Ligand binder design. Structure first.
Ligand SMILES: *Cc1cc2c(nc3c(=O)[nH]c(=O)nc-3n2C[C@H](O)[C@H](O)[C@H](O)COP(=O)(O)OP(=O)(O)OC[C@H]2O[C@@H](n3cnc4c(N)ncnc43)[C@H](O)[C@@H]2O)c(*)c1C
Ligand SMILES: *[C@@H]1O[C@H](CO)[C@@H](O[C@@H]2O[C@H](CO)[C@@H](O)[C@H](O)[C@H]2NC(C)=O)[C@H](O)[C@H]1NC(C)=O
Ligand SMILES: [K+]
Ligand SMILES: [Zn+2]
Ligand SMILES: [Zn+2]
Ligand SMILES: [Zn+2]
Length: 473
């Protein structure tokens, strides 16, 4: 067909329907949302990426990059059938490392586990990114990237010092603080909007030698306990929590909430740093035993797998997810949250679900040392990052009536807050919002600048997906 012929003439490898490569590359991480691209360009070089974009232009197609394919909305496909899909996951190398500056150049199909493995094993270096080893560098870094080092060292995006980008017109350009700084600003938080990143240029830190994983089983058996407890954790997060502590409250057992965390220091140093919160928690919590880790052991520890060096996709899932970023959860917000928690959520027994309340902001959070004005990322004024997750078996159909579960929980918080108090996080992409509403909540106070930037770098909407920023001049 026209697109196949076009790709072939340009020397761009293409997946053939019916082959193993096609079957692998076309599989969404969220099998709730499969999409059928018109063709899959399995790129090996920056030139292939540029050729693919060129082919999209001449055949008037929409083009979408897929890196680790972890988009909760399958946006790597385009969020709909019929795009040219630029499949990036064979481009996995740390192109170069500079031992004078600590800057690594990295290909856009490297997964977080593979990246961490190469930087640590080969160079003794580390970056602050997410926990899941199969996640793509590109989708992740482009929109933020939060994990168990973000309090200490900031977002994955905060490591970005430069990018090589393929634009909607197929030109290759460099972006950094001193070259195309407007484009650089957009890539660092809304990067799916402005081109396909071909090379990430990343600042690293020495791989930590002394880390302690900690956990506390909270044992909140009623509404009172959970209200008092979430309050105690916010206060600590807002005012006390030292730089070295990274943690969240999570519940993976429909009523068995815990704190899990990573501390930059010894077990004794953690205990002293956390003790003020321990003194305010409702009585009946149990401090679980600590685990002493080095950098690469910690990556493995929070993995949920027996290895981390992933160069292929991780097992697919079948789910819906939502998110919230909040200034505070105090007042009616936490009251409504806890009611719903016990009256509704804890009686949902037919599938696996979770929430995570991430300590994202607060006084000593590195995330918060960058303003909303400095990069595309719009949540620098938010203490909490919240994930809600609703997962069925792969052989089951996600039922239409099941959406209202996470919808209800999110509403219970939002109805209690002014609109300026909360947003949503595009790395926990929720496709059940129209283009205008979603970009309002994903990008906050930065949306007006993003729209103007979009009208400069993608006026035709070549990179269209249902939740892309609108080009507005
Ligand atoms: C599946 C999964 C996701 C997780 C997990 N844990 C996370 C955590 O510890 N911290 C977080 O902050 N987020 C976590 N997430 C969510 C993921 O971070 C997001 O789902 C990321 O967006 C995933 O990125 P990726 O795997 O690369 O997703 P894609 O579906 O390929 O792309 C998403 C988005 O990005 C665009 N895009 C891809 N590639 C490029 C390039 N090269 N240039 C520009 N834009 C690109 C896509 O088109 C799409 O729009 C844990 C788990 C298990
Ligand atoms: C919620 O649960 C907690 C403990 O799980 C309750 O506190 C316990 O119950 C009574 C009343 O305070 C005390 O005699 C116990 O010793 C408490 N146990 C612990 C471990 O502290 C609390 O009362 C409950 N709140 C309610 C039911 O409203
Ligand atoms: K198609
Ligand atoms: Zn590897
Ligand atoms: Zn308080
Ligand atoms: Zn293994």
């Amino acid at each position: 067909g026209a697109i196949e012929a076009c790709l072939s003439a340009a020397g761009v490898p293409i997946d053939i329907p019916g082959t193993a490569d096609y079957e692998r590359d076309v599989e969404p991480f969220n099998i709730r949302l499969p999409y059928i691209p018109t063709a899959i360009a399995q790129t090996q070089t920056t030139a292939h990426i540029q050729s693919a974009v060129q082919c999209a232009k001449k055949l008037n197609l929409k083009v979408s990059a897929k890196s680790g394919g972890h988009s909760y909305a399958s946006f790597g496909f385009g969020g709909e059938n019929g795009h040219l899909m630029v499949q990036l996951d064979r481009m996995i190398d740390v192109i170069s490392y500079n031992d004078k500056t600590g800057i690594a150049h990295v290909e856009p199909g490297a997964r977080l586990g593979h990246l961490a493995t190469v930087l640590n094993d080969k160079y003794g270096r580390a970056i602050s990114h997410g926990t899941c080893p199969g996640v793509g560098i590109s989708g992740h870094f482009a929109h933020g990237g939060f994990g168990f080092s973000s309090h200490m060292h900031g977002l994955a995006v905060d490591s970005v010092v430069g990018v090589t980008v393929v634009l909607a017109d197929g030109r290759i350009v460099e972006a950094s603080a001193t070259e195309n700084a407007d484009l650089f600003w957009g890539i660092k938080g809304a990067g799916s909007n402005f081109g396909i990143v071909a090379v990430w240029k990343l600042a690293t830190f020495p791989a930590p030698k002394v880390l302690t994983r900690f956990g506390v089983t909270l044992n909140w058996k009623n509404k009172t306990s959970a209200l008092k407890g979430i309050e105690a954790v916010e206060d600590y997060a807002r005012w006390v929590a030292p730089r070295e502590v990274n943690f969240r409250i999570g519940d993976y057992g429909a009523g068995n909430p815990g704190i899990e965390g990573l501390y930059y220091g010894t077990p004794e140093q953690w205990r002293a740093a956390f003790q003020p919160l321990l003194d305010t928690l409702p009585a009946g919590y149990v401090v679980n035993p600590t685990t002493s880790l080095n950098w690469i052991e910690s990556v493995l520890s929070y993995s949920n797998f027996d290895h981390v060096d992933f160069i292929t996709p991780q097992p697919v899932e079948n789910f819906y997810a939502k998110s919230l970023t909040l200034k505070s959860i105090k007042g009616d917000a936490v009251k409504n949250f806890v009611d719903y928690y016990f009256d509704v959520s804890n009686k949902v027994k037919d599938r696996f679900w979770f929430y995570q309340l991430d300590v994202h902001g607060g006084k000593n959070s590195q995330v918060t040392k960058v303003t909303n004005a400095e990069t595309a990322y719009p949540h620098r004024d938010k203490l909490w990052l919240i994930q809600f997750y609703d997962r069925y078996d792969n052989n089951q159909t996600y039922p239409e009536t099941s959406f209202k579960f996470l919808d209800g929980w999110v509403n219970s918080v939002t109805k209690a807050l002014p609109k300026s108090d909360w947003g949503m996080y595009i790395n926990y992409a929720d496709p059940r919002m129209d283009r205008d509403y979603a970009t309002k909540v994903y990008y906050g106070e930065n949306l007006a600048r993003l729209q103007k930037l979009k009208a400069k770098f993608d006026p035709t909407d070549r990179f269209y997906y249902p939740q892309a920023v609108r080009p507005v001049k």
